[PDB]
Design a binder for these strands. Structure first.
Lengths: 63, 183, 135
DNA sequence: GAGCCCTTTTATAGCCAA
DNA sequence: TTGGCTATAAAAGGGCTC
């Protein structure tokens, strides 16, 4: 799944330190966000099958 | 035979004026009441005033952009108040080359419109993608103004340098619109 | 700010990635939030790599370097591809505007065509009006 | 260098928000 | 309802890509 670049840029700039950002940036971050969720969900899925996916099975991936 | 009878109303005006003297935005943003500044995000001060309700973008070169007015002189007044503001803040503020750069107008033909067809008969002047934007985008060549036409009969006109161009554009499009009325 | 990627986007991702896996609504909320954390993580690292690069605007390069630097080096493959299509899209769009403004039907005839449609429409509503006025 | 980006404003208006 | 995305015109400049 692809994510809203406009939303991604707005989110990036919730940080006062972040200045101007190249138009193409938010779109690559979207792809990156996509690769991060697939890798993350697939690990958490493993953790779930070693016990429905819960909040705990996920947190143990952002540890 | 007859004039539409509908007169488009001005909703926005963008003018520019050159104050003719270097400016230190840090300084201006520092004391100016309603002034914003983030050379981080945007290289210009963003000042506003209640009457006429507007917004000015003040750059380092002294040049300024004034937006929000509903008439030519209202925009020139606001532009002047922004000038006196920069002035009182201790800067050699002049008021040079004031120019209206854009005018926006809008009105209601009071009847639905078949955008679906209009974009066929005039495809070379239209861009209609309801998936992307609900309105039909019409590019008139003479005068050179852009119109936003909506199924509801509301119409926006923009791109004008002088209000006559807006009245000329609407009077041209009205009969076209009546030819694509929906029923 | 309380901006977050749309719930629906995350749900479409979960469905496409974990076909046939019940995911707690609570957990779905955690993923939506991990998203914003990641954006901040990448952005912060990129913003530093940027200051150093004596540049002013966070470029697609600074983001690639932050990825490697952060430990996400294995994404740089698929991320480079997207950066590509982005340059291509921007390039095609530049050339399309160039042609629109330089190789189209001379304005002169475009104007004529358009005025024809205008005069013609005035004619129609002229009759349709005068006729109804003859009642 | 030619030319696009970003920022501001405004009418209008569907789609979206979990 | 509120408000942001999407769309249009235009200026101002410092930042960038072929």
């Amino acid at each position: 799944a692809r994510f809203p670049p406009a939303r991604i840029k707005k989110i990036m700039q919730t940080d006062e330190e972040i200045g101007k950002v190249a138009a193409a940036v938010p779109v690559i971050i979207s792809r990156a966000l996509e690769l991060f969720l697939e890798s993350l969900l697939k690990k958490a899925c493993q953790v779930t099958q070693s016990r429905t996916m819960t909040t705990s099975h996920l947190k143990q991936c952002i540890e | 035979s007859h004039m539409s009878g509908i007169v488009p109303q001005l909703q926005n005006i963008v003018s520019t004026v050159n104050l003719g003297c270097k400016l230190d935005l840090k300084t201006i943003a520092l004391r100016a009441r309603n002034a914003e500044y983030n050379p981080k995000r945007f290289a210009a001060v963003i000042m506003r005033i209640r009457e006429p309700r507007t917004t000015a973008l003040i750059f380092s070169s002294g040049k300024m952009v004034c937006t929000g007015a509903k008439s030519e002189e209202q925009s020139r007044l606001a532009a002047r108040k922004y000038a006196r503001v920069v002035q009182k803040l201790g800067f050699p503020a002049k008021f040079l080359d004031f120019k209206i750069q854009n005018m926006v107008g809008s009105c209601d033909v009071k009847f639905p419109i078949r955008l679906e067809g209009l974009v066929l008969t005039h495809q070379q002047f239209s861009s209609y993608e309801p998936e992307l934007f609900p309105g039909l985008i019409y590019r008139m060549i003479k005068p050179r103004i852009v119109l936003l036409i909506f199924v509801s009969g509301k119409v926006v006109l923009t791109g004008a340098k002088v209000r006559a161009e807006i009245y000329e554009a609407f009077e041209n499009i009205y009969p076209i619109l009546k030819g694509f009325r929906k029923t | 700010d309380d901006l977050t990627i749309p719930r629906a986007a995350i749900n479409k991702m979960i469905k496409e990635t974990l076909p046939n896996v019940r995911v707690a609504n609570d957990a779905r909320e955690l993923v939506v939030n991990c998203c914003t954390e990641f954006i901040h993580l990448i952005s912060s690292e990129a913003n530093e790599i940027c200051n150093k690069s004596e540049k002013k605007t966070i470029s697609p390069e600074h983001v690639i370097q932050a990825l490697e630097s952060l430990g996400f080096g294995s994404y740089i493959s698929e991320v480079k591809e997207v950066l590509q299509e982005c340059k291509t899209v921007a390039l095609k769009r530049r050339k399309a505007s160039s042609r629109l403004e330089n190789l189209g039907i001379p304005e002169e005839e475009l104007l004529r065509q358009q005025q024809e449609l205008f005069a013609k429409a005035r004619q129609q509503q002229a009759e349709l009006a005068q006729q109804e006025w003859l009642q």
